[PDB]
C-alpha cells in the first residue's frame, strides 16, 4: 500500500513478526496441497494406464508412475511436518486444528490408493471416496487462508 502505513517502528516491526510467521506457515500448507494434488494426478494417470489393458511389460504394481506418487506424497507430509512444527498463533488455532483433521484423512486416503494400485486392484481404487476427502481438505485450507488474510490485514493501517 503506500503513504501513511505504520504509527512507528514498534508498530511496523510488530506487523512484520506476525506476517513473517504467517508467510512461513502458509508456504508449508501451500506446498503440502500442491504435492497432494500431484499425487492424485499421478495415481489417476497410473490407473488410466492400468485400464487400457493389454498393457506393455510392467505397469501396475511396479514401474514408475506409482513411484512418482509415492515421492510427491512423501514430500507433502514433510512440508506438513514443518507446518506442524511451527508455533500455532492464537488467531489461527481453530483453522489450524480443522486443517490437521482433514489433512490426516486425505494423506491416509492417498497412501491407500497407492497400495490398491500397487496390488492391481482397480475396484478398490474406485470404491474409495477420494474426492469427498480431497474437497474437505480444500475447504479447510481455504478456511485457513481467509483467517490468515484477516490477521494479515490488521497489521497495517486500515485506511488503504
Ligand atoms: C518485510 C516483510 N514484511 C513486512 C515488513 C518487512 C515490515 C512490516 C510488515 C508489516 C506487515 C506485514 N509485513 C511486513
Curated annotation (Swiss-Prot):
Residues 40-49 are annotated as: The 3 Arg may form a positively charged pocket, which binds the alpha-carboxyl group of the attractant AA. It is found in: Cell inner membrane. It comes from the Bacteria. Residues 10-160 are periplasmic. Belongs to the methyl-accepting chemotaxis (MCP) protein family. Receptor for the attractant L-aspartate and related amino and dicarboxylic acids. Tar mediates taxis away from the repellents cobalt and nickel. Unlike in E.coli tar, it does not mediate maltose taxis. This is Methyl-accepting chemotaxis protein II. It comes from Salmonella typhimurium (strain LT2 / SGSC1412 / ATCC 700720). The lineage of its organism: Bacteria, Pseudomonadati, Pseudomonadota, Gammaproteobacteria, Enterobacterales.
Amino acid at each position: 500500500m503506500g503513504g501513511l502505513l505504520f504509527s512507528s517502528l514498534q508498530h511496523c516491526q510488530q506487523g512484520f513478526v506476525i506476517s513473517n510467521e504467517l508467510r512461513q506457515q502458509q508456504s508449508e500448507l501451500t506446498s503440502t496441497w500442491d504435492l497432494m494434488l500431484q499425487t492424485r494426478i499421478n495415481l489417476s494417470r497410473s490407473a488410466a494406464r492400468m485400464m487400457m489393458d493389454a498393457s506393455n511389460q510392467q505397469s501396475s504394481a511396479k514401474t514408475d508412475l506409482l513411484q512418482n506418487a509415492k515421492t510427491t506424497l512423501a514430500q507433502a507430509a514433510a512440508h506438513y511436518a514443518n507446518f506442524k512444527n511451527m508455533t500455532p498463533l492464537p488467531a489461527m488455532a481453530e483453522a489450524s486444528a480443522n486443517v490437521d483433521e482433514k489433512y490426516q484423512r486425505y494423506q491416509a486416503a492417498l497412501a491407500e490408493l497407492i497400495q490398491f494400485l500397487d496390488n492391481g486392484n482397480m475396484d478398490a481404487y474406485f470404491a474409495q471416496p477420494t474426492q469427498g476427502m480431497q474437497n474437505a481438505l480444500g475447504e479447510a485450507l481455504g478456511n485457513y487462508a481467509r483467517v490468515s488474510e484477516n490477521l494479515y490485514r490488521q497489521t497495517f493501517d486500515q485506511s488503504a
